[PDB]
Design an enzyme around this catalytic site. Structure first.
Site, PDB file in Angstrom:
ATOM      1  N   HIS E 150      36.097  34.375  42.455  1.00 25.09           N
ATOM      2  CA  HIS E 150      35.551  33.939  41.144  1.00 25.09           C
ATOM      3  C   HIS E 150      36.067  35.497  40.429  1.00 25.09           C
ATOM      4  CE1 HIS E 150      33.572  30.925  41.652  1.00 25.09           C
ATOM      5  NE2 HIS E 150      33.403  31.195  42.137  1.00 25.09           N
TER       6      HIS E 150
HETATM    7 ZN   LIG Z   1      31.009  28.359  45.118  1.00 20.91          ZN
END
Ligand SMILES: [Zn+2]
Ligand SMILES: [K+]
Ligand SMILES: [K+]
EC number: 3.5.1.98
Lengths: 30, 613, 99, 209, 385, 52, 143
Positions: E150
């Site tokens: 992320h």
């Molecule tokens: Zn996740």
């Protein structure tokens, strides 16, 4: 004597656990 | 105290229950100030009104403004007692948000990726050669635009026991963190103390250790020491060994070596509870359907909810009618009854309840059994002798005017029961049970094939006699439902037996007992509300006939309305006998009782008839 | 941890005048044969344990248990893993020893 | 005790500054009281989903960031107004789904904000009426209504409301007006509201005759 | 083009064997994100313990990578962000409240004692694994401390500060001409897809739950820009999906891309928030249904990297990671747990199983069908290596 | 006097603590081993070869 | 009447104790909304419960599970699941042996004195002693 009973799940950790009298006394007897 | 053992005492009551006596004076002053008995009486009226959680706090302070606003110090005393803080706000500007998208919108390609603006905000990276500069790229960026979902669903939500398990996991992780940190700090302090022991008595006095001590993530030790002493008297010590590491860190270490021992024993003593608390909660958290539905239709099979359902269909029908598109609605609820054997099957359970129940005297129990039998046979038009023979053959293989049971339209294929609430309630209780049973029966053949095809877990059902033989599975479900209704089987056994044997596709029966308890009490209140007795009488008088005119249909509606007040509503339950199609309409009082007009002259007849009386 | 024993000028039975001391024994001595089978390592010639300091720890545990059941009967809740306890007056003793 | 003077000139100057996109009409929206409103509006009763309601979802669809300062055309009938007003068979009025004052979340019901702006039904109280601001987020015309409420009570009449979509607010305060104490969102604790914000841009009346 | 099929059990192929490099660092487990924060590195430590009592070290080579240096971290990220990461600290946070909002560090991704240590440990594990996969010394590099998919080029999202996966992939790109990223986390792999969006030398495929779900990206028509057009693939699923359904979605698409895109190496993100009983996810896979994906990509025979990731219920992801580590050595582990020290975490039965619940499934054959057929429709230009 | 059974209570605590201590050290030993599994085999081989 | 006064003061002091909550009710006050655990977004979920702390931008949707605290008899205690667990009777779990029969009758104490765990450890120990003796033998002849 200050015994202090308050909330306790566990007990208080106990107190952790010279003097040549009877040895020399045996030597006296001998 | 030597001879007698020790007993846990009941409890010490909380503090906020027995501290009241200094404020009991102010209220006499308030009584003196208001003077009159009736104003004081409505004052106490609103006080109790609040103490029963009926009105808010600000509204209470406003009502006491209507009374004691005349005195400023008294009103400020009261205001601060209830903690009504001043809403000193008339000049309030609803200010804008700082963030959402102040800066970014340009040429956008695809749903969720837009070009970065071409500007020399170029931050140079170091490690990139030509390759990393050509494969990695930075022109386009992805930004969420939660574009309406172009759909609609519900969101998953956690079962009640999953959360207990998550909280247990977090509790034990926190215990483990504290004990591991205490150990590691013991290690560092031990290294230091060993450096300090073997010295000369003057290189001690001038020894200083800088913040960190050699811990790359140092703060832990300070944290540990705080939690050992406190966060008031802990900075004092954390600094007293930052300036005297020679005399004040064989004392901070001898105590960490007590707290390690004690905190691990505490972890053990509470892992006892953590362990006993996990066998119970774990297995009943893997059944989400059988635990959601249980509460859902424990609190949704109530009078308010189904009324609201049908009235919702009514209101959206009529507001769609306000729109020119659709002409007009005919009826609201539709039911089909393809298999009629289930009817007797419901009786298989129905009075099976009453034979066990104690809340009724056996005579009126015979009476409401008569209610059920005669009512089903007359409404759904199957012979009473058929239910007779089903009853007899049932206990063989498992081995009368209805008025005092309780006490031009030719070719009559349709019959209308114009009912008040209780009749509607009892009827759709019946209808719910019937449809859920028919759904559980339709696939019973391949259910037998399931249980047989499973060729050799839970050994209990083996010794218990709760497994599933290659027998008729649907009839076995009937038998087990009888078993639990009469109490031959406590709940969880029924539960897991049905679950594994049949499938998890039979949760809708896990509550069957309770729902039958809904139709042996509503039918009993049918015979004890005399008005509903009049309703059923008029119904059977209108139904036992074979031919009558629509004028007598209006007459029937009229003096069935006679027995129910203006506030009460009515529902017309049409039943057509050819296909057992049962429709329900939600009828308001003065408007028309029955089927809307097909053409207009039938309701020319309606006009003349209804205004003729 | 261990079982509290009766000491010279210490825990509770020798202070209040209740019992004697524990009188440790010698390494190598007449041992009973049954004890020599329960494999062994036998000290403390005769009944070392101190009773009153078992009673007091029992009272502390009972108080904690009553607090838990009171949390239940008054806030209608399930306890939440009691907090790991810091020191009480050993902080005063540490500060007094450093100064 | 007082009607606090709420102000929206800051937010409106903001959206005229940084969203100067030309005001356009996204579409027409047919009010429903148990579901959402699609802009093509397949028939209202089409979908019925039950998990074997009491918390029916917010009416307005998620309009998205790229459509701030664009107005939506909502249609309301008479029975809907009358059901919300006197609290019978209207769940979005028992749950009291309204957040803010003069600018509300996308979770505040259109009918409760209609009431929250002073729009009343029947013969209006011909007393010392405070300056009605029934369209507060229209910068020029803070009270934009066309037509009149019929003189007979019980009339079937409808409303064409234009709602204006505005950027998220920092906070939404609880402000009591006309017996509707709205709900608060934006406090010391609450995270910032997810969707956009809105207010009644315009109203016109319609008579069924 | 979706065909329902049952789930036949796991069968280890002996016709292919490989040498497994499994990196680890015995310090990663002393860094705690916070007090109640969901992410734990304790996770990784737990998995290690199980691998140590199943005797799996007798079949693979444990290493300890060298913590990456700032001039490697600066291949993907920017210098200002790496500096800020090396300087920021819970001690001196206020002095930074300017850049602390430019780099998203402080709101949801907290600061803790020694986050730079953890970031370096992860990046180093992954870069060493990729280096040794380029130098023929092994066939499978396993790093359960990586998988922070992320993180952005200049921002920290979803507890992911450093995006070590992009580093590992840039490394694999020095030797192989094409790589394939495969993300089976319940969340979209936004960071890697954003990093590699307009190139064709890497093809990305994620199996994520779409809707009103963090991070809000990953829609069916996001297929990359310009050169990397058709070289991105997103599979938006829905709640409740189970082993048979997930398998009938997973195997055909993976097979299609391996037949058409012709990759030289594969990276596999094995997040455990797509299991049953998670804390932040709503799928319903079981241990075997998860491990099946690893098995089915292993049976293709190419260089593979296996990085960890999400998963926020510790015992479930520990068991699952240990089971996939067993089945990487062509073994199937007994279903009892040996007595390790994190034993009481595994009550009440103490077995090697992750059981699904009877949660409702929402993916209907029509949905998966049109999804897969239009994916296959847009995949008809991914043909030449 | 009464009998609060302190022996058996401390015995229960001990027997519960015994298996937790050991397993940390057993895992440490297992970790040490994992270096010596490509050295001990060929060492034993070469030693028996040189011996015979 | 002064009893109304007594109870009013009691309620005010109890709600000012700092505990017990503020729940989101209905207008009639008979529909108490369910807890907001499991939701990811917050648009359309404002009425549930501690939902105040749920965003669609923060991947941590677990703040609704932080174990409310309560001051009582001196210190702050945490609660698992209050009410609105008769399975587990902790006054019975948490206590000492009262007799010899409690080694099999008690349900926690029996889980210790019947563990097959001290016997598997000895097996692992002897099994490593055997390998190390193989080594000791192969070195003792080189020398
Ligand atoms: Zn996740
Ligand atoms: K994914
Ligand atoms: K790509």
């Amino acid at each position: 004597i200050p015994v202090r009973p308050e909330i306790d799940l566990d007990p208080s950790i106990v107190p952790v656990v010279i003097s040549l009298n009877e040895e020399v006394t045996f030597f006296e007897k001998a | 105290p030597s001879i007698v053992p020790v007993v846990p005492e009941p409890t010490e009551p909380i503090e906020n229950n027995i501290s009241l006596n200094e404020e009991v004076t102010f209220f006499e002053k308030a009584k003196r100030y208001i003077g009159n008995k009736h104003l004081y009486t409505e004052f106490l009226k609103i006080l109790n009104l609040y103490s029963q959680d009926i009105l808010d706090l600000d509204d209470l302070v406003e009502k006491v403004d209507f009374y004691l606003g005349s005195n400023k110090e008294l009103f400020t005393w009261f205001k601060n007692f209830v903690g009504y803080q001043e809403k000193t706000k008339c000049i309030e500007n609803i200010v804008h948000e700082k963030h959402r998208l102040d800066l970014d919108l340009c040429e956008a390609f695809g749903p969720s990726y837009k070009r970065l603006p071409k500007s020399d905000t170029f931050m140079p990276c170091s490690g990139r050669d030509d390759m990393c500069w050509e494969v990695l790229n930075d022109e386009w960026v992805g930004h969420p635009v939660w574009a309406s979902e172009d759909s609609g669903f519900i969101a998953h939500r956690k079962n009640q026991y999953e959360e207990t398990l998550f909280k247990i996991e977090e509790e034990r992780h926190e215990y483990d963190f504290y004990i591991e940190s205490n150990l590691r700090t013991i290690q560092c302090l031990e290294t230091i103390v060993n450096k300090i022991e073997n010295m000369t008595e003057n290189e001690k006095a001038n020894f200083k250790l800088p913040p960190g001590l050699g811990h790359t993530s140092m703060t832990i030790y300070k944290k540990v020491i705080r939690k050992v002493y406190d966060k008031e008297r802990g900075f004092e010590i954390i600094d007293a060994l930052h300036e005297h590491p020679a005399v004040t860190a064989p004392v901070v270490l001898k105590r960490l070596k007590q707290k390690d021992e004690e905190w691990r024993r505490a972890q053990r003593e509470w892992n006892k509870v953590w362990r006993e608390l996990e066998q119970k909660v774990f297995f009943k958290s893997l059944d989400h359907l059988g635990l959601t539905f249980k509460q859902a239709d424990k609190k949704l099979l109530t009078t308010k909810q189904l009324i609201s359902e049908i009235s919702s269909i009514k209101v959206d029908q009529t507001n769609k009618k306000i729109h020119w598109l659709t002409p007009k609605p005919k009826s609201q609820l539709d039911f089909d009854f393809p298999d009629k054997n289930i009817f007797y099957d419901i009786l298989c359970l129905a009075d099976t309840f009453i034979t066990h129940t104690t809340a009724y005297s056996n005579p009126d129990k015979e009476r409401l059994k008569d209610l059920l039998k005669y009512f089903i046979s007359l409404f759904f038009s199957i012979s009473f002798e058929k239910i007779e023979e089903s009853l007899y053959s049932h206990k063989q293989n498992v081995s009368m005017s209805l008025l005092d049971i309780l006490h031009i339209i030719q070719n009559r294929s349709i019959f209308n029961l114009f009912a008040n609430t209780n009749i509607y309630i009892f009827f759709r209780h019946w209808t719910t049970i019937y449809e859920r049973l028919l759904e559980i029966k339709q696939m019973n053949e391949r259910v037998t094939k399931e249980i047989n095809t499973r060729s050799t877990l839970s050994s209990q059902l083996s010794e218990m006699g709760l497994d599933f033989v290659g027998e008729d599975a649907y009839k076995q479900v009937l038998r087990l439902s009888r078993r639990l209704i009469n109490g031959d089987l406590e709940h969880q056994w029924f539960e897991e037996s049905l679950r594994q044997a049949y499938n998890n596709k039979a949760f809708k029966l896990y509550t069957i007992d309770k729902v039958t308890q809904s139709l042996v009490k509503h039918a009993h209140t049918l015979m004890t509300d005399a008005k509903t007795a009049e309703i059923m009488a008029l119904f059977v008088k209108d139904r036992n006939a074979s031919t009558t005119s629509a004028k007598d249909q209006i007459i029937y509606r009229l003096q069935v309305r006679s027995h129910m007040s203006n506030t009460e509503n009515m529902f017309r339950i049409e039943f057509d006998k050819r296909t057992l199609h049962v429709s329900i309409q939600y009828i308001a009082l003065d408007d028309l009782t029955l089927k809307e007009p097909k053409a207009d002259e039938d309701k020319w007849k309606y006009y003349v008839t209804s205004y003729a009386l | 941890y261990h079982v509290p024993i009766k000491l010279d000028n210490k825990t509770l039975s020798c202070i209040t005048g209740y019992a004697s001391a524990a009188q440790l024994c010698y390494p190598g001595e007449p041992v009973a044969e049954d004890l020599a089978c329960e494999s062994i390592e036998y000290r403390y010639r005769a009944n070392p344990v101190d009773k009153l300091e078992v009673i007091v720890d029992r009272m502390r545990l009972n108080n904690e248990i009553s607090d838990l059941e009171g949390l239940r009967k008054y806030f209608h809740s399930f306890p939440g893993a009691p907090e790991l306890n810091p020191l009480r007056d050993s902080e005063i003793n540490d500060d007094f020893h450093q100064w | 005790y007082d009607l606090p003077n709420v102000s929206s000139q800051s937010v409106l100057a903001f959206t005229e500054k940084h969203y100067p996109n030309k005001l356009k009409n996204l579409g027409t929206l047919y009010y429903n009281r148990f579901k959402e409103g699609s802009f093509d509006e397949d028939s209202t009763s089409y979908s019925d989903r039950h998990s074997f309601n009491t918390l029916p979802p917010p009416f307005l669809p998620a309009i998205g960031i790229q459509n701030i300062n664009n107005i939506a055309t909502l249609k309301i009938t008479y029975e809907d107004i009358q059901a919300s007003f006197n609290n019978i068979e209207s769940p979005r009025k028992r749950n009291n789904e309204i957040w803010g004052c003069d600018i509300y979340s996308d979770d505040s019901d259109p009918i409760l904000v209609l009431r929250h702006c002073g729009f009343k039904i029947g013969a209006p109280s011909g007393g010392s009426f405070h300056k009605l601001r029934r369209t507060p987020v229209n910068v020029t015309n803070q009270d934009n209504v066309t037509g009149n409420l019929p003189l007979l009570e019980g009339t079937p009449f409808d409303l064409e409301v234009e709602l204006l979509f505005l950027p998220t607010l920092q906070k939404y305060p609880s402000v009591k007006r006309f017996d509707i104490t709205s709900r608060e969102w934006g406090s010391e604790a609450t995270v910032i509201h997810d969707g956009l914000s809105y207010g009644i841009y315009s109203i016109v009346i319609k008579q069924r005759l | 083009v979706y065909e329902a099929t049952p789930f036949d059990p796991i069968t280890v192929k002996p016709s292919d064997k490989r040498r497994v490099a499994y990196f680890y660092d015995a310090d990663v487990g002393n860094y705690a994100y916070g007090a109640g924060h969901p992410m734990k590195p304790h996770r990784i430590r737990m998995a290690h313990s199980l691998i140590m009592n199943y005797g799996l070290y007798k079949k693979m080579e444990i290493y300890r990578a060298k913590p990456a240096t700032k001039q490697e971290m600066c291949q993907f990220h920017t210098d200002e962000y790496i500096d800020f990461l090396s300087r920021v600290t819970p001690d001196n946070l206020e002095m930074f409240k300017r850049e602390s909002v430019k780099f998203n560090v402080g709101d949801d991704c907290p600061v803790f004692d020694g986050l730079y240590e953890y970031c370096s440990i992860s990046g180093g594990g992954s870069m060493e694994g990729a280096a040794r996969l380029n130098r023929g010394k092994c066939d499978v590099a396993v790093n359960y401390a990586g998988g922070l998919h992320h993180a952005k080029k200049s921002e920290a999202s979803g507890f992911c500060y450093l995006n070590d996966i992009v580093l590992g992939i840039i490394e694999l790109l020095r030797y192989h001409p094409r790589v394939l990223y495969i993300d089976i986390d319940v969340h979209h792999g936004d960071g890697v897809e954003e990093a590699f969006y307009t190139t064709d030398r890497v093809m990305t495929c994620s199996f994520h739950k779409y809707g009103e779900f963090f991070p809000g990206t990953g829609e069916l028509r996001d297929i990359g820009v310009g050169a990397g057009k058709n070289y991105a693939v997103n599979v938006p699923l829905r709640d409740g999906i189970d082993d048979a359904t997930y398998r009938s979605v997973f195997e055909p698409v993976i097979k299609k891309i391996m037949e058409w895109y012709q990759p030289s190496a594969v990276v596999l993100q094995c997040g455990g928030d797509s299991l049953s009983g998670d804390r932040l996810g709503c799928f319903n896979l079981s241990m075997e249904g998860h491990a099946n994906c690893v098995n089915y990509v292993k049976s293709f025979g190419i260089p593979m990297m296996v990085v960890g990731g999400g998963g926020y219920t510790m015992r479930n992801v520990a068991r699952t990671w240990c089971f996939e580590t067993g089945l990487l050595n062509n073994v199937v582990l007994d279903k009892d747990l040996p007595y390790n020290e994190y034993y009481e975490y595994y009550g009440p039965d103490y077995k090697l199983s992750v059981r699904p619940s009877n949660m409702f499934n929402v993916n209907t054959p029509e949905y998966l069908d049109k999804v897969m057929t239009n994916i296959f429709a847009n995949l008809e230009n991914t043909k030449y290596a | 006097p009464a009998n609060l059974f302190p022996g058996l209570n401390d015995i229960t605590d001990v027997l519960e603590e015994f298996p937790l201590a050991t397993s940390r050290y057993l895992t440490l030993l297992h970790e040490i081993d994992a270096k010596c599994v490509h050295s001990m085999p060929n060492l034993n081989e070469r030693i028996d070869k040189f011996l015979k | 009447e002064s009893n109304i006064i007594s109870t009013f003061t009691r309620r005010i002091i109890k709600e000012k104790s700092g505990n017990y909550q503020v729940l989101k009710r209905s207008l009639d006050g008979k529909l108490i909304y369910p807890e907001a655990t499991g939701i990811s977004s917050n648009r359309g979920n404002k009425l549930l419960q501690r939902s105040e702390v749920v965003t669609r931008r923060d991947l941590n949707n677990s703040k609704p599970m932080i174990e409310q605290t309560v001051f009582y008899n001196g210190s702050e205690h945490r609660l698992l699941q209050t009410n609105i667990s008769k399975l587990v009777n902790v006054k019975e779990i948490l206590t000492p042996i009262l007799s010899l029969g409690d080694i099999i009758n008690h349900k926690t104490i029996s889980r210790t004195f019947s563990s097959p765990i001290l016997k598997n450890l000895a097996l692992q120990i002897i099994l490593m002693i055997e390998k190390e003796q193989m080594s000791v033998v192969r070195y003792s002849q080189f020398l």
